[PDB]
Amino acid sequence: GLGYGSWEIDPKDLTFLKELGTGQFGVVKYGKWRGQYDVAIKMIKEGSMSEDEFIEEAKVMMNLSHEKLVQLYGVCTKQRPIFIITEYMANGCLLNYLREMRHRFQTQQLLEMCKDVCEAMEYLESKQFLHRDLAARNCLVNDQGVVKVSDFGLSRYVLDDEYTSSVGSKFPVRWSPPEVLMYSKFSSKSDIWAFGVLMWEIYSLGKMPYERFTNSETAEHIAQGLRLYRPHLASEKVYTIMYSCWHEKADERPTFKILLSNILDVMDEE
Numbered sequence: 461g462l463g464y465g466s467w468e469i470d471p472k473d474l475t476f477l478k479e480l481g482t483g484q485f486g487v488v489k490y491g492k493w494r495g496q497y498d499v500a501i502k503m504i505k506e507g508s509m510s511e512d513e514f515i516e517e518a519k520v521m522m523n524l525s526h527e528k529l530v531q532l533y534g535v536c537t538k539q540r541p542i543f544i545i546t547e548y549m550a551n552g553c554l555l556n557y558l559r560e561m562r563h564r565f566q567t568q569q570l571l572e573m574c575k576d577v578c579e580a581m582e583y584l585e586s587k588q589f590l591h592r593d594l595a596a597r598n599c600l601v602n603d604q605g606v607v608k609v610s611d612f613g614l615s616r617y618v619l620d621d622e623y624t625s626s627v628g629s630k631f632p633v634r635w636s637p638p639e640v641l642m643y644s645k646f647s648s649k650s651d652i653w654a655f656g657v658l659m660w661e662i663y664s665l666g667k668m669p670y671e672r673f674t675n676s677e678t679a680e681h682i683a684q685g686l687r688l689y690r691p692h693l694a695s696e697k698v699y700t701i702m703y704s705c706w707h708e709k710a711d712e713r714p715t716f717k718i719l720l721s722n723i724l725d726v727m728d729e730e
């Protein structure tokens with residue numbers, strides 16, 4: 461089924477309706493399942509993914525369920541290439557959504573985008589599940605403007621060495637705390653750091669972090685104590701929240717449960 465019964469999905473039940481673009485593993489198409497239900501169809505470019513390891517982990521992701529997590533519906537593994545079938549998010553990638561100036565966002569909307577992500581992240585934390593590549597590019601936006609976290613944990617199965625070497629051209633340097641860039645120490649607290657940068661992305665309407673620095677310069681500078689400036693759209697109270705995510709000591713960073721409380725406190729003042 462589609463979130464019910466088997467999670468090996470029959471490709472014959474799928475109809476391809478539009479190209480959505482490409483992501484980490486290549487082409488993504490919009491389709492319908494059994495003519496009724498919208499789905500996104502991730503066609504996994506062969507050689508890009510550690511497929512056996514992912515399919516085993518997919519059993520684990522099938523059991524995560526939260527409103528603000530993009531739902532994994534199943535896989536199509538009986539063909540070349542394999543497909544991953546997920547919830548359809550009609551407004552696309554959060555990063556691109558933020559950069560479309562026509563939306564004329566209120567800060568009330570930006571803050572709720574942060575709450576959306578923080579709720580998904582608190583749930584993953586409660587399940588001891590790291591995202592490992594949290595950023596605006598890995599969030600999606602549905603037809604109601606709701607933001608949801610996507611492709612949690614999938615960095616573990618990326619075979620492109622430019623993405624997994626901390627010095628590769630594609631490593632999420634700008635979203636990584638010093639202990640990751642320096643020692644490869646991943647934890648819930650490196651997710652917390654990334655969420656702070658993600659909050660800065662949102663309030664910066666999708667500007668790239670540290671845009672005047674190369675990856676290597678950024679890693680050096682954040683390690684010394686350089687930090688992202690307060691976005692003009694972020695109040696002091698909002699900036700204190702993202703800023704708290706970038707403490708030099710991991711154990712001084714908050715949890716996602718604390719961050720959620722902090723965001724809700726600010727929302728409740730409106």
Ligand SMILES: NC(=O)c1ncc(N2CCCCC2)nc1Nc1ccc(C2CCNCC2)cc1
Nearest residue numbers: 480481482483488500547548549550551552553
């Ligand atoms: N699960 C999904 O719905 C979904 N997953 C991954 C993904 N992509 C492509 C972008 C890069 C990351 C991988 N796109 C997705 N949907 C999607 C939906 C609409 C658009 C259009 C709508 C008009 N304005 C924006 C463009 C683009 C992408």
Ligand SMILES: [Cl-]
Nearest residue numbers: 670687688689
């Ligand atoms: Cl800067």
